[PDB]
């Protein structure tokens, strides 16, 4: 059977330390674990052997009673550890009062399922699963190291700190890896992280499995460069050997967990491939007295550690002759000058092992003090040491560790801890070692960003797509990982609403700069000034001066017989209307306002009706004679026909400015002028024009005072064509106001030019 | 301690049957399992304690040797089963050759991890998890039921058959639920299904936990109406209890699994909450010879089974007076008239238990006949029965099952099997039953869709969003599962590229019907129909007729002195140009072509200019005299200017068809006409017109033949005004061709109608 390392005592506590390597894949069934381990094996085994013969020699802990030990090998396998635990409990079918729990979390679970039946407390130093924190299933399990929830949080913090978004995930099969990845996914995908794929692999899988895994990992190589390994000690080594085999030598940045840590045995011979990796290590200062005791050890003297001779032969490649464990495999013979001092590395968690073997001692001491305070030794009430009492005392245990910090188990049998984010760099030529960079204690991580990536060209960001926010572009996600987007550009009309929708602005509106929001488009009107309104207003002003001159001539020659042929008042109402129609242009081309446009409508309406109606009455009188003072009256009544019409139109169309939007980009303001509200007065004016066309066609060339009718007929004919010429523009355009102004102005200055100008032209003679 | 049913023999098989219920959450640590179970307990115990006395009686199976037993209760818990297994192996520290392992995945693995260390083959009848198919970790585990991969495939088939896409999932904590749900998730998310959320719950959790789980499940009533368990017996019952408590009676459709099967003890008293649910049950015909043995049992005589009296007093809520197990909790007593024939239901896994026991017996028989073929009994070669040999013999066993089929173990340790879909329907009022509605065997699925939902208003398909492949509204996904999409339209000119993106068509193009594709929109041209161009062509034809009449008169009355004041040809060329006007109109309104382009340009550039040059020469000769044949040459030199300038513009701009895009919806075909390419000939025409105006008023009214000077000046004035009247429309419009046609026509019929016509007006007398 297997060998065991006894040491005598009054109270015996067990331990399970992974002295030998994991059994190979092909010999799992035989359960014959392979090579020996130094750090995880002989160092730990020696620690107990010492940290009990310190406790025994110390009078202040457990006086007059001697803790012994039975240290037994678990080969880091759940099957072997279970058989060893069975060997532990064979006595209960001297009793074992407790064990120092095996390193692996899955192995810890397997051994706990058996130990809790016989009420045997178990203390772990490296088991770091969340699954072991549930006291319903694991009542008799306590740890001196924090859970790996905090470790997953630390890894997530590291990932989020360096913009890393698109990462790959690898985890060892078991409880450690499974729980690690579960926590990592749950608490990462929430915040910002985005896992490309997750792969699982056994520690003892063949090289073929690792090759396949590396191919699958390289499948996403261009984008996902960070691999987040909640993996174990040997899984990462397998990955490194696969990397060496496949020729890939630094396209990945492995992001380890507390299986890689500070360990040198996982990067021996493959330092070129793992350079740049970030690991997370439970903090524990190196003990000193253990080194002093350990370095002086020799294979000749240490008989109490049955694995010592084999390890001694394995480390320095030679053989021992004068001892049974010759192991003739090694050729040369060891000389009496070899020592462990050279290339001596004391692993992490050597603080934790001693802290455990203490916590157990302090629990025993407290329960001894409580049960029989008077006696000093094994009292009658202690001979069958009760598991329940021991666990009750152990739950509330509280002391100072070797590191100087204090140890307390909370309600979950757990102890708090701080992480230390190591980094694998290359100091000199062919010289690699782990460099402490950061830390993480209770959600706060201090990181030396300078030490990692001693430059500004850090590792390529593990992102699926570049930041898509340069302007109008707006990301669309194609069903796959929510962190792969395309850069589809929205249109100029819309602005980015969120980041996945862009929404159109109002009918009169435009997106602001940088597409941040939307704001009202500036309004445009016919400003006072401008090219064309000057050409309008100068025409209007010169027309006003001309008509003032004409009325001055009229009033001067008030009683002249050559002009006292027609009704003088009739030849007045014309010019008054002309003047009003002239000021109509001025009140038309102006800043749109409530007070202005109704007056503008009145101007465009009445003047070219009343003046032309006076002309109609004059032509009526002439044609009928070829009456009395009633004609001035009929004029007034004829005018009014229109005043009533326009006042009626004023009701359904009150003067109020509305904004016009011919296109999405420009906005104009005009009042309630409408096609129906303009055509009707223009229609009436047109009807009057057609009525007076008949009388024009009647008069032809009648010999009158200075041949007035001959000029007025031609004038009215010209006005007809000028009026009908401008309709296509006015129907469809944005120049309605200026066109109306021009049309009115040009319709005027023509009738006066032929009805009054020749009279004034010859009035000088 | 815990009682253990014995039966003496030579070779003792063990077994673990869940006689008692799972220990409550509060008393897990005490390990006191609660109430007794009939189906999963006493029925199975009675089965084994018979089959192994039928086998003993049978001479053809294991002759001259008597199989025994040692049934123990696992209480459906990992902890209790482990201690029972320890009790099994205590002898090996009579030996137990093997066990009929517990039917529970987690319990199976827990017992296996202990048994394989002692080479004890274990056969499970109800452990269907996938994890137990690995022979690297579970070399000593065989089962007579198929794995859960097939069951997950069956559930996925059922889900996909009824269009169910947005589903919710709950699985019992443990190896069975976890593995089953992992397989279901993979195999569903691969194909087309879409899980809203996944919940995990322990089967023995309090009512508060189930209430919280049901709240989380009701968080998605509107869409996720199907919840697909893969959960255990006493987890669907928890769901039903929560449904009863918070008053849901059909808001969900539970889709059960092998755990639910058709068990009547998971819906007793909660039928109203579970109506309509679909379950999956391993097919096993009811064994008949077992019923005859079972129904005749009496508590007075049956003293092999130690649990039988307790079960008897539990089933009939009474107490037995004459035996120590009085259990005075019950009030009334039991008369000698109770019989198990009332409401007798046989569990749906009684085939598999007997099959497993037969398998173990046949394996033992094979190994017996191989090791010592001659001797009939237990030869000396098997006093220490080796577990390895027994496992080797078991792995290749092959016999006929109780149901009728054959039992064989493949290389993976499991056995083939077929499933049976079932539906829990309310047949009569206050009467419910499980109805077989199909089956599932090796991939192919048959379902009687008529029996389930005997209507068309079935359970609403659980979809997060309506299928939005309608019209042109596209699909956008929003950071949640690629099944909860909001449907948005895109622009009318845009056609759908794929299900998620739409893009606009070309500058000149339009999306086809149903927005599937894009096609070239037909071009729009100056159609020969329509009222306006028909009127234009009629006017051009009338102009041609007028010119032909004029030339007929012109020639008839050529040499006559009344018209022989000016050069007939000076007049003729004018006539040639006026005809060329109408020819230009004809060549303008047509299909725009390469030839027609330059022809139309030549016409418009030449005709009016060459006519007006002759006109100005004719006017200026008379004006200056108020000569000879030099007038024709001095006019031709002016005519050459248009030819030169048009040739220059021809060199600058070649004639070609140009396709214009006024809007995204309208496309026209026009020529390469340019503003600068037409303004210059217009400029020359204009300066010629103003020169003619200058020459006009000089002559004013001159007495000539029919007083030509009287009319021609007025005619040209009319031409000038009509020319400048039409230009605003041509400046802004889309009807350039027809506007130019009208302009040319109007400029025509005036140079003749009152300049040539008066000459011939009195030519007939
Ligand atoms: C990205 O990382 C850099 C430092 O590596 C720093 O700007 C910050 O942590 C991140 N920036 C953004 C915009 O997320
Ligand atoms: C939905 O299921 C029905 C059968 O129940 C069948 O038409 C097809 O599988 C699905 N129909 C559509 C339109 O996808
Ligand atoms: N921490 C791991 C165990 N472990 O694996 C290694 O390779 N080192 C180490 O400590 C766990 O909690 O399971
Ligand atoms: N089939 C389950 C076990 N099981 O759970 C129940 O509630 N019934 C039942 O058979 C498994 O394979 O784990």
């Amino acid at each position: 059977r297997r060998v065991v390392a006894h040491m005598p005592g009054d109270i015996i506590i067990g331990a399970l330390f992974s002295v030998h390597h994991q059994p190979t894949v092909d010999k799992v069934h035989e359960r014959k674990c392979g090579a020996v381990r130094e750090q995880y094996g002989i160092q730990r085994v020696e620690a107990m052997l010492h940290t009990l013969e310190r406790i025994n020699s110390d009078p202040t802990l457990l006086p007059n009673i001697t803790l012994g030990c039975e240290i037994r090998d678990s080969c880091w396998h759940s099957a072997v550890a279970l058989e060893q635990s069975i060997e532990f409990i064979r006595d209960s079918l001297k009793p074992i009062v407790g064990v120092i729990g095996p390193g692996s979390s899955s192995v810890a679970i397997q051994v706990q399922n058996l130990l809790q039946l016989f009420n045997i407390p178990q203390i772990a130093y490296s088991a770091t699963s969340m699954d072991l924190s549930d006291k319903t299933l694991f009542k008799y399990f306590m740890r001196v190291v924090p859970s790996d929830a905090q470790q997953a949080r630390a890894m997530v913090d590291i990932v989020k700190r360096y913009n890393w978004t698109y990462v790959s995930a690898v985890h060892t099969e078991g409880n450690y890896g499974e729980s690690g990845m579960e926590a990592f996914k749950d608490m990462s995908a929430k915040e910002g992280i985005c896992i490309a794929h997750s792969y699982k692999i056994y520690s003892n899988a063949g090289e073929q499995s690792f090759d396949k895994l590396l191919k699958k990992l390289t499948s996403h190589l261009p984008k996902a460069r960070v691999v987040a390994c909640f993996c174990e000690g040997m899984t990462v080594r397998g990955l490194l050997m696969a990397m060496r085999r496949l020729g890939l030598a630094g396209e990945f940045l492995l992001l380890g967990s507390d299986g890689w840590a500070d360990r040198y045995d996982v990067t021996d011979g493959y330092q070129r491939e793992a350079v740049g990796g970030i690991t997370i290590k439970l903090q524990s200062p190196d003990v000193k007295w253990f080194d002093d005791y350990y370095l002086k050890l020799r294979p000749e003297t240490n008989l109490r550690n049955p694995w010592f001779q084999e390890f001694w032969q394995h480390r320095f490649q030679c053989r021992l002759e004068g001892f049974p464990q010759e192991n003739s495999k090694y050729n040369k013979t060891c000389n009496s000058s070899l020592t462990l001092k050279t290339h001596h590395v004391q692993d992490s968690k050597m603080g934790f092992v001693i802290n455990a073997i203490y916590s157990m001692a302090y629990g025993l001491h407290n329960m001894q003090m409580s049960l029989c305070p008077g006696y000093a030794g094994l009292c009658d009430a202690m001979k069958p040491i009760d598991g329940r009492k021991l666990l009750e005392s152990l739950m509330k245990t509280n002391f100072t560790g070797v590191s100087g910090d204090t140890i307390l188990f909370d309600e979950n049998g757990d102890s708090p801890g701080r992480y230390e984010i190591m980094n694998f760099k290359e100091m000199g030529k062919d010289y690699f070692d782990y460099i402490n960079v950061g830390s993480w204690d209770n959600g706060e991580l201090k990181m030396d960003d300078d030490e990692v990536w001693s430059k500004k060209s850090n590792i390529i960001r593990s992102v699926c797509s570049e930041p898509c926010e340069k302007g109008q572009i707006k990301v669309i996600r194609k069903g796959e990982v929510s962190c792969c987007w395309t850069c589809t550009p929205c249109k100029e009309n819309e602005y980015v609403f969120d980041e996945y929708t862009c929404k159109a602005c109002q009918l009169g509106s435009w997106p602001t700069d940088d597409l941040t929001g939307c704001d009202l488009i500036p309004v445009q009107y016919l400003r006072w000034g401008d090219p064309e309104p000057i050409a309008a207003v100068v025409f209007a002003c010169l027309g006003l001066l001309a008509t003032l001159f004409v009325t001055v001539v009229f009033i001067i020659y008030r009683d002249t017989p050559v002009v006292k042929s027609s009704s003088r008042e009739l030849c007045y109402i014309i010019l008054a209307g002309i003047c009003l129609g002239y000021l109509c242009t001025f009140c038309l081309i102006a800043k749109p306002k409530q007070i202005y446009c109704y007056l503008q409508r009145i101007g465009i309406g009445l003047s070219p009706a009343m003046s032309y109606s006076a002309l109609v009455t004059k032509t009526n009188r002439i044609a009928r004679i070829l009456s009395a003072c009633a004609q001035l009256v009929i004029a007034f009544i004829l005018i009014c026909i229109q005043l009533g019409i326009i006042v009626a139109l004023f009701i359904m169309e009150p003067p109020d400015i509305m904004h016009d939007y011919p296109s999405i980009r420009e906005v104009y303001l005009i009042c309630n002028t409408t096609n129906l509200g303009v055509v009707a007065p223009l229609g009436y004016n047109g009807l009057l024009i057609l009525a007076c066309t008949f009388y024009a066609f009647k008069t032809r060339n009648v010999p009158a005072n200075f041949n007035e009718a001959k000029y007025i007929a031609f004038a009215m004919y010209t006005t007809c064509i000028i009026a009908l010429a401008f309709v296509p523009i006015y129907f469809g355009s944005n120049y309605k106001a200026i066109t109306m102004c021009f049309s009115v102005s040009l319709s005027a200055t023509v009738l006066l030019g032929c009805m009054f100008v020749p009279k004034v032209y010859i009035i000088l003679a």
Side-chain angles (χ1 to χ4, degrees), chain A:
Chain A
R1 311 182 311 293
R2 271 187 187 72
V3 72
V4 47
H6 301 300
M7 141 179 311
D10 314 303
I11 304 170
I12 301 179
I13 84 183
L16 288 177
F17 293 121
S18 61
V19 178
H20 291 329
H21 261 286
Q22 207 166 2
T24 48
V25 53
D26 65 323
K27 287 178 170 60
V28 175
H29 307 299
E30 279 76 4
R31 267 180 290 109
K32 39 178 298 197
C33 45
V36 82
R37 320 177 71 168
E38 181 186 358
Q39 275 89 12
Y40 278 54
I42 309 303
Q43 293 198 3
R44 291 177 183 178
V45 171
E46 283 302 305
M48 171 148 327
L49 288 191
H50 194 60
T51 186
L52 284 190
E53 81 170 1
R54 259 178 49 114
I55 285 170
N56 281 350
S57 76
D58 194 9
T60 196
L61 255 74
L62 297 174
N64 213 347
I65 63 183
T66 61
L67 306 87
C69 49
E70 282 191 0
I71 308 177
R72 249 160 177 172
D73 154 43
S74 83
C75 313
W76 202 272
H77 201 234
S78 67
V80 189
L82 193 55
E83 143 185 338
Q84 297 307 107
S85 166
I86 280 168
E87 296 303 320
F88 271 150
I89 314 311
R90 264 263 278 282
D91 306 354
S92 174
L93 287 181
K94 307 185 69 173
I96 306 298
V97 312
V99 308
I100 283 72
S104 183
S105 72
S106 76
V107 173
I109 289 187
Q110 281 309 125
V111 68
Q112 180 57 227
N113 281 346
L114 167 58
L115 267 187
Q116 70 178 2
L117 300 189
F118 303 85
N119 297 317
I120 292 178
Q122 151 177 340
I123 320 173
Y125 42 75
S126 72
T128 319
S129 291
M130 304 202 359
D131 299 342
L132 280 161
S133 171
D134 193 349
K135 287 302 107 180
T136 314
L137 304 173
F138 301 114
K139 179 189 216 187
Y140 281 65
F141 181 78
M142 332 175 289
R143 303 182 286 197
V144 297
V145 285
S147 153
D148 73 341
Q150 313 188 28
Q151 182 161 155
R153 195 84 200 95
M155 284 187 12
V156 168
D157 286 354
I158 293 174
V159 170
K160 79 189 278 182
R161 173 142 173 159
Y162 297 137
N163 323 112
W164 293 337
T165 294
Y166 203 66
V167 292
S168 303
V170 182
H171 75 270
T172 319
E173 295 259 42
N175 264 264
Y176 174 61
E178 268 301 310
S179 179
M181 267 314 106
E182 280 196 3
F184 182 82
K185 284 183 186 175
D186 285 3
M187 82 181 41
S188 81
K190 258 166 54 178
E191 171 260 324
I193 322 300
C194 207
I195 291 183
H197 213 266
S198 78
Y199 314 96
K200 52 179 70 181
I201 185 65
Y202 274 92
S203 292
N204 60 349
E207 307 204 9
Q208 166 80 9
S209 286
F210 284 108
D211 292 6
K212 263 146 62 183
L213 164 61
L214 199 52
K215 290 311 300 176
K216 290 202 274 283
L217 263 186
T218 52
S219 175
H220 327 310
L221 186 44
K223 303 144 71 180
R225 318 199 65 102
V226 167
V227 169
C229 230
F230 227 116
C231 304
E232 227 161 75
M234 273 317 115
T235 290
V236 69
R237 179 160 182 73
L239 262 170
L240 295 190
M241 311 209 298
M243 267 186 203
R244 164 65 59 73
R245 277 192 302 271
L246 276 67
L248 199 147
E251 280 72 359
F252 285 116
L253 184 125
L254 293 195
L255 175 54
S257 288
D258 189 59
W260 192 352
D262 186 81
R263 297 177 56 179
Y264 279 119
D265 69 68
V266 313
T267 57
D268 261 336
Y270 302 88
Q271 303 155 353
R272 294 304 311 171
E273 280 77 348
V275 59
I278 312 289
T279 86
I280 300 190
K281 183 174 91 91
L282 259 319
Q283 158 177 359
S284 59
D286 292 326
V287 297
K288 310 304 302 314
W289 49 264
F290 165 68
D291 284 354
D292 292 346
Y293 160 68
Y294 175 68
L295 294 200
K296 300 170 186 71
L297 273 181
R298 301 223 64 75
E300 289 79 7
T301 65
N302 198 325
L303 272 319
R304 61 174 177 180
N305 185 5
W307 305 286
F308 193 57
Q309 286 148 54
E310 161 174 18
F311 154 73
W312 185 273
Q313 280 191 49
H314 167 80
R315 181 189 165 96
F316 328 104
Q317 306 270 14
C318 56
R319 71 193 305 267
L320 273 70
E321 267 68 17
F323 309 83
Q325 297 71 355
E326 280 183 1
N327 192 359
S328 59
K329 161 161 46 57
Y330 311 98
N331 40 16
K332 74 173 182 282
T333 288
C334 321
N335 46 52
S336 59
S337 70
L338 293 157
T339 192
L340 299 127
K341 157 151 48 53
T342 63
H343 314 70
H344 168 78
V345 162
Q346 165 196 341
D347 58 328
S348 302
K349 295 169 167 49
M350 196 51 46
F352 299 143
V353 163
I354 293 165
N355 277 359
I357 307 162
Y358 264 176
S359 79
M360 182 86 97
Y362 267 121
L364 271 180
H365 179 243
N366 281 4
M367 175 252 281
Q368 192 275 340
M369 227 175 71
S370 169
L371 225 63
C372 38
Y375 198 68
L378 288 192
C379 50
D380 184 26
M382 219 185 201
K383 294 303 300 186
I385 298 180
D386 182 53
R388 317 174 161 254
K389 295 301 181 294
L390 176 51
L391 194 141
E392 200 187 1
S393 83
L394 266 168
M395 262 291 126
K396 305 173 297 182
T397 216
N398 191 0
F399 65 112
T400 52
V402 287
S403 62
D405 319 2
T406 59
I407 295 176
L408 53 93
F409 306 136
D410 56 353
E411 66 278 359
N412 299 335
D414 191 311
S415 181
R418 298 173 301 296
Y419 297 111
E420 279 184 359
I421 303 166
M422 312 285 305
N423 178 26
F424 198 23
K425 280 177 71 71
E426 178 190 345
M427 306 301 92
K429 302 314 300 172
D430 202 352
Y431 182 45
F432 305 80
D433 44 358
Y434 291 83
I435 289 303
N436 189 348
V437 160
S439 177
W440 185 110
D441 36 359
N442 301 249
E444 174 202 8
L445 72 153
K446 307 189 183 179
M447 183 80 107
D448 186 10
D449 279 342
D450 182 43
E451 184 41 68
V452 286
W453 314 321
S454 175
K455 54 190 173 174
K456 290 296 103 180
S457 78
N458 76 321
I459 183 56
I460 306 166
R461 294 180 181 175
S462 290
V463 295
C464 179
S465 53
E466 72 287 344
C468 191
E469 67 268 355
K470 68 204 89 65
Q472 179 86 259
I473 54 187
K474 158 213 47 56
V475 295
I476 53 167
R477 31 204 171 183
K478 281 291 184 175
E480 315 316 301
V481 265
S482 66
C483 325
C484 292
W485 57 62
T486 46
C487 274
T488 175
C490 199
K491 319 159 194 68
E492 78 306 320
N493 174 36
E494 310 89 320
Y495 67 110
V496 165
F497 174 52
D498 48 1
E499 200 168 358
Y500 314 82
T501 60
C502 56
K503 57 180 279 300
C505 276
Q506 214 58 272
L507 194 47
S509 283
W510 209 239
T512 188
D513 207 317
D514 307 327
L515 277 311
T516 84
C518 194
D519 53 356
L520 265 299
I521 47 184
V523 71
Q524 180 162 14
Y525 60 93
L526 297 180
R527 196 215 64 177
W528 268 357
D530 306 6
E532 303 311 314
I534 312 313
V537 295
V538 65
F539 183 111
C541 180
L542 71 91
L544 274 178
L545 291 180
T547 181
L548 259 299
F549 154 70
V550 162
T551 201
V552 157
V553 173
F554 168 106
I555 64 180
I556 283 182
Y557 297 87
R558 165 74 161 290
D559 62 325
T560 316
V562 303
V563 313
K564 205 173 190 184
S565 56
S566 298
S567 178
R568 314 189 290 183
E569 211 80 10
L570 266 183
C571 308
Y572 164 60
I573 60 183
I574 298 182
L575 58 93
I578 289 320
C579 287
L580 167 150
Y582 285 16
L583 78 90
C584 162
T585 88
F586 289 136
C587 78
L588 170 53
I589 170 64
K591 182 139 178 177
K593 215 174 179 181
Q594 162 58 217
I595 198 171
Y596 282 156
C597 84
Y598 59 78
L599 172 58
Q600 158 256 335
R601 249 167 284 111
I602 298 311
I604 43 183
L606 74 84
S607 178
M610 53 84 88
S611 298
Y612 289 74
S613 72
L615 165 148
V616 165
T617 55
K618 183 178 185 300
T619 58
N620 280 123
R621 171 197 172 176
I622 299 307
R624 204 263 291 268
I625 211 175
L626 302 176
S627 65
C629 60
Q631 51 203 358
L632 186 69
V633 178
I634 73 182
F636 292 173
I637 293 171
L638 290 195
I639 303 169
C640 296
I641 301 176
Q642 178 217 48
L643 278 172
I645 282 173
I646 73 168
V647 161
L649 260 69
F650 204 85
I651 302 302
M652 310 68 89
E653 287 76 23
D656 276 313
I657 308 158
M658 63 174 291
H659 273 121
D660 198 0
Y661 320 109
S663 294
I664 58 170
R665 203 164 291 99
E666 74 276 11
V667 49
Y668 303 109
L669 76 154
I670 40 165
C671 87
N672 283 331
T673 82
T674 51
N675 291 317
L676 270 297
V678 166
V679 66
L682 260 294
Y684 170 71
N685 308 316
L687 256 300
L688 252 58
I689 279 301
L690 188 141
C692 57
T693 50
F694 176 108
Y695 282 65
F697 176 80
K698 262 205 159 183
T699 170
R700 311 307 316 127
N701 313 278
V702 155
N705 283 9
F706 307 74
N707 305 116
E708 35 198 348
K710 179 251 286 185
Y711 284 153
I712 78 185
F714 190 20
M716 213 270 286
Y717 177 76
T718 55
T719 62
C720 178
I721 49 160
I722 290 300
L724 62 91
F726 276 40
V727 54
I729 312 100
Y730 189 73
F731 190 13
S733 165
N734 206 262
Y735 289 107
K736 288 157 284 283
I738 197 67
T739 46
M740 215 54 248
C741 184
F742 264 50
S743 86
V744 163
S745 90
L746 303 156
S747 69
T749 74
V750 168
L751 57 98
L752 80 89
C754 301
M755 181 64 77
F756 290 111
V757 160
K759 183 190 55 47
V760 181
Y761 180 41
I762 310 314
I763 212 63
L764 272 292

